[PDB]
Design a binder for this molecule. Sequence first.
Ligand SMILES: CN(C)CCOc1ccc(/C(=C(/CCCO)c2ccccc2)c2ccc(O)cc2)cc1
Ligand SMILES: CN(C)CCOc1ccc(/C(=C(/CCCO)c2ccccc2)c2ccc(O)cc2)cc1
Lengths: 224, 224
Amino acid sequence: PYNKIVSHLLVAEPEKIYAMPDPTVPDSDIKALTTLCDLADRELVVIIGWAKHIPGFSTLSLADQMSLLQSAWMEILILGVVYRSLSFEDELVYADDYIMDEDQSKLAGLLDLNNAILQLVKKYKSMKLEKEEFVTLKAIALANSDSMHIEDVEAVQKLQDVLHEALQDYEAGQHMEDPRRAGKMLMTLPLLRQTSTKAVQHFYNIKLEGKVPMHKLFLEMLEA
Amino acid sequence: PYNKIVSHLLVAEPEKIYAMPDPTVPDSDIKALTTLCDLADRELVVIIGWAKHIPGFSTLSLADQMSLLQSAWMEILILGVVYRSLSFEDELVYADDYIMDEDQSKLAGLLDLNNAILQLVKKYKSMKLEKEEFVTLKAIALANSDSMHIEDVEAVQKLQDVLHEALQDYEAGQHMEDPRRAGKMLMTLPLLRQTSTKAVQHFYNIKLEGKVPMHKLFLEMLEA
Ligand SMILES: CN(C)CCOc1ccc(/C(=C(/CCCO)c2ccccc2)c2ccc(O)cc2)cc1
Ligand SMILES: CN(C)CCOc1ccc(/C(=C(/CCCO)c2ccccc2)c2ccc(O)cc2)cc1
């Protein structure tokens, strides 16, 4: 039987979300970016709800909740896309109704970025990443997000340790064939940070945030 | 059984390299970058030599050797500065004769970058990073560098496994008090990737490679 943290993360895992592109609009770069914005906004709503079910998270200060989300939001988005794309070949499943191939990535101006995201997909395919590992890694990505402005270092570090421990216990219980599997999972996190870093700077480069700063969006969602 | 890997990493460890900045040139933005360029080039020579001592490295093809180095070189340079800087406060020690504080970083346009490196120093200070840990994470950084051009994926995966095992063996025998210490060390690698990624982008933005691309320098250094 799974440890309570992993099983809790499984029940907290949000339902499928759809991109729902406008069928009346001819495919273009603008259409793709519009659709991705629409998708991401819907996702961010449930990601904030999800974070508040990560044990420890809701009892941190508003400031610390905000810092972790500010630093990790794109990693969580991308990691979901990666998990969704595992049974596919050279394709990114943003949603069940929105799957982007190489050509479509080029048109959207996302080729180099999604190439790196396909690297992640490739690496998780060979490790045969399970859903339990995925939700836990997502939580760890949030907690291990390296914000510069943490107020309660001990609480955040305890949260990291709690989630690391949960991973390690799951691997000890479910993958005795590989005593080093948990560490292999943690070693995938640098490429996640890398691509997320490049995504976030592309995000600001082309001004997809709009007229309202992310900080202001998160504060709205967190105190709703 | 004995594990010789950490021991050979320790004997493979290069000697101190000195900046030797010109004592007749006015302390300025240009002087810093010149000092760092000339130090880094000498550092990279011993790094290539060091990498040749990593078991499995030089049995890779030249293309894969070059590919790991292309992806990792800045992480290796940075982790060295980080380790040299652990007994210092809010200062980065590029060499024994070249230490840079907050004000010198502004002069050189490196503040945002060095604040992130100091963030790494602060994290390692708290865990009490040991030399054995340091050298092994350097080796892991090389092997886990996520190059997109790898030919023999399996051999590179094996090298990662060998080094990961070494760290875990080391942690198990020497830090029984924390059964999760190896994983904590691995969770420091994202911030290093982030930091390097940003430094390499800056590297190219201000065009410090000069008239000879880094891959050409590596080919040259590897053939000597
Ligand atoms: C601020 N709000 C109004 C809009 C939210 O903005 C976003 C717009 C797009 C994205 C996304 C991407 C895809 C990145 C990998 O291909 C992006 C990032 C930067 C520039 C262009 C596109 C995105 C990523 C993952 C998703 O599951 C959904 C959307 C994430 C957020
Ligand atoms: C061909 N050759 C002249 C290339 C020179 O390459 C370098 C020049 C400088 C650097 C270095 C930095 C410091 C980064 C952290 O503070 C840098 C990077 C980008 C832009 C400006 C400075 C550097 C980093 C670590 C070192 O141990 C030595 C030098 C690294 C490489």
